[PDB]
Amino acid sequence: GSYYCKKGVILPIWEPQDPSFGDKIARATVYFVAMVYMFLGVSIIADRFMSSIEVITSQEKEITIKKPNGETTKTTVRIWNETVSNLTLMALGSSAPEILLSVIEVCGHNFTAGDLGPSTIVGSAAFNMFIIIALCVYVVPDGETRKIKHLRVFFVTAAWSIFAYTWLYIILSVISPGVVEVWEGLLTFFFFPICVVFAWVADRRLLFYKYVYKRYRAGKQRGMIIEHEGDRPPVSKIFFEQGTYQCLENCGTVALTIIRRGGDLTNTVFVDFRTEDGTANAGSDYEFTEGTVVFKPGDTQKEIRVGIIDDDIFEEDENFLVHLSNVKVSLACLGSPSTATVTIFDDDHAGIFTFEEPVTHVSESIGIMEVKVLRTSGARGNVIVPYKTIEGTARGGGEDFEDTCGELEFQNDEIVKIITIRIFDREEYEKECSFSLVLEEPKWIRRGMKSKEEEERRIAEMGRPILGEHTKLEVIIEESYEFKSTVDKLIKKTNLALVVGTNSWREQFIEAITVSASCFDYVMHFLTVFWKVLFAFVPPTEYWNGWACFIVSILMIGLLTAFIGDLASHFGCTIGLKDSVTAVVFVALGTSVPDTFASKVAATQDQYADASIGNVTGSNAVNVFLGIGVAWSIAAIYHAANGEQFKVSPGTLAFSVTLFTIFAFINVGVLLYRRRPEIGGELGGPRTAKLLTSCLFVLLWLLYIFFSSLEAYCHIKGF
Ligand SMILES: CCOc1ccc(Oc2ccc(OCc3cc(F)ccc3F)cc2)c(N)c1
């Protein structure tokens, strides 16, 4: 015999209270078994609580599907919007126990500091932050990562979560060392509105900044669909070899080849060559050229060059003739076709302007659709092309798609330009629609200024921006792909033959026979038979559109956590174990089982890993802030109404807080893997990381509980 007892909230003190060790243990192990059994109860209840705080804070869209048989199906289906708020309204629900327990203790035990609220708060904080993270690391698929994306806000969230626990040390040890004074404790609650407004503004901030791709997945509820962030998915005749030459104006200089064939090649030949205007004009289009071409002993051909003048005047097709004469053998002669009609192509304009196609099919998922134009027959000169959006099958005006029009200038020598437009994510299953993107006449710009020589100049000027064929784009609005696939999967699986005559209060009861009418499941649920049956009676499903379970399951959590508080109070200090220890060791691992499942499924199911850690951070923040706020606010106010100090214990907690903060800094540190870019993403992919970081975190949690227990044993620690 080492410890006496304290009267509970519901349960009374065990009658003899001090038998031999033959009974100082049996009642203790009975207590422990009843406690783990109530922990299973609380697990199932908080499961239902989360699954009914998710029906509220969610939108339902109506979907109709035309069956090929000749009829259709019209049914509304919820789509849980996964904002940042919808993770701080389920990091809270999932942490409903560790708050209410704290509320009961101080009320139950005569408005005095019952040291099983802070101990369980810190114990569950360390347990989650060191073990749920290990699971989020080593429960992902065999090899793959879901590395965090919004690392920009994790710093703030984690620095808040760790400012929370080192604030307990602040309230009761540094401003007043042993008192939760009246003014403090009030802000411990008011700091929760800080978090809620932070969520309620930093969701909108990152909502419109991101039209990012919203992947869809199947919630484990009846018909919930969860949206989240993802990525997007024998005479030597001499003559021209060719009597006609083709070349472009931009070349300037062009080459002509003149071949001697047959006869005696050893004779040096001198042949006069000279150019003459055909349709060409010297000094404006090309330069007149003349001279002598010399063939060495043994040559077969020679090359000459003539200059061609290029300008910004888009002239018509044009040519001029080069002629040869005066063949001298110093057997050989001037070959036939000794004149080359060099013909030229002018390209000094822009010309044809046409769209890609007149019709395209684009899903609403893109949101910002980016389609191009195309130029043909040159690009010189500047243009100003109007682009108009005209409504179609659906009604535009920035309702189904952002309908705006206007004008875009195409700079000189720019072949390709791409115009954008914005598109709504109406967030609904539909079919195709249509809209139009007609083009009209651009405005031409040449040189900034805007007898036959001038008339031919205008005959050249005719080259201007003329529209091509494709001048109006009727885009087709399509259906989001993943959304279609997910709703198809769900309809093929569930949500069939539904009407509210009797949905659950008659059918939440069938689980007994529905599950026990292979051999593993038997013993897997002969401990939950009672719990499930007792949990189908009182929290009936969402008849009140979400609030038909959240107004009851909270009361049942109150009942079960009253049982937990009383039994943990009467088990600790019965075997002799200090009351605080069994929080950090025993109660914490059972009050926070829902969190583990929530984070685990979030990690293994989505594509990122910020919700799975957002859960941990939100739970750690709300536990401490809300729990101590309400419990110690009411305690301090009660002692204020008649003038007392509320002398909470400074010690027995400070060491745990400081140790947790040190270990939490180590956590946040090693979270960013050493050499991370080739030690994989956040969760998985590297065998060594995935398989040893988890063991490190488990060792850290083990050291935490071990040293909390040691400090409670001997207390000789430096604090
Ligand atoms: C000053 C208060 O700081 C706070 C500290 C902790 C808090 O708890 C949570 C922390 C992170 C959460 O997820 C973040 C998230 C971001 C994202 F881009 C996409 C999905 C996400 F899940 C949810 C809850 C809150 N809400 C505020």
DSSP 8-state symbol, 510 = T
Determine which helix (DSSP H) or strand (DSSP E) holds 340, and give its type and residue range: strand 339-345
Residue in this structure with the two tokens 């040449």, named with its chain if needed = 446
For the chain, give me the number of helices (H) and strands (E)?
A: 20, 23
CA dihedral 359, 361, 367, 368 (to 10 degrees): -40
Q: Cβ(328)–Cβ(272) under 8 Å?
A: no
Helix (H) or strand (E) holding 359: strand 359-363
In angstroms, the CA 182 to CA 592 distance is 30
CATH homologous superfamily of 26-223+494-504+540-713: NCX, central ion-binding region (1.20.1420.30)
Do the Cβ atoms of 642 and 140 come closer than 8 Å? Answer: no
Contacts of 299 (CB under 8 A, 6+ apart): 260, 265, 269
Rounded to an integer, what is the distance from CA 540 to the centroid of its chain? 35
Question: Residues of CATH 2.60.40.2030 domain(s) within the chain?
Answer: 236-345, 353-450+470-479
Q: CA of 549: how far to CAs of 55, 103, 460, 553, in Å?
A: 10, 21, 82, 6
Is domain 353-450+470-479 annotated with CATH 3.30.470.30? Answer: no
Alpha-carbon gap, residue 584 to 586, rounded angstroms: 6
Q: Are 422 and 368 in contact (CB under 8 A)?
A: yes
Which residues make Cβ contacts (< 8 Å) with residue 506, sequence separation at least 6?
none
User: How does DSSP classify residue 95?
Assistant: G
For the chain, where do the domains classified as CATH 1.20.1420.30 start and end? 26-223+494-504+540-713
**Cα of 621 to ligand 1 centre, how many Å?**
10
From 53, 80, 84, 599, mutation site for ligand 1 pocket: most ligand atoms within 8 A of C-beta: 84
Tally the residues of the chain.
719
Q: Who contacts 4 (Cβ-Cβ below 8 Å, separation ≥6)?
A: 17, 18, 573
Both structure tokens of 511: 């689980």
Q: Are 330 and 268 in contact (CB under 8 A)?
A: yes
Our answer on whether the CB atom of 626 is closer than 6 Å to any ligand 1 atom is: no
CB–CB of 427/421 below 8 Å? no
Q: Which of 81, 87, 92 to mutate to test the pocket of ligand 1 (most atoms within 8 A of CB)?
A: 87
Nearest CA to ligand 1 atom 1: 195
CATH number for the domain whose boundaries are 236-345: 2.60.40.2030
Q: Given in angstroms, what resolution was this structure solved at? A: 3.5
> Measured between alpha carbons, how far is 451 from 659 in angstroms, rounded to an integer?
98
Ligand 1 touching residue 619 (CB < 6 A): no
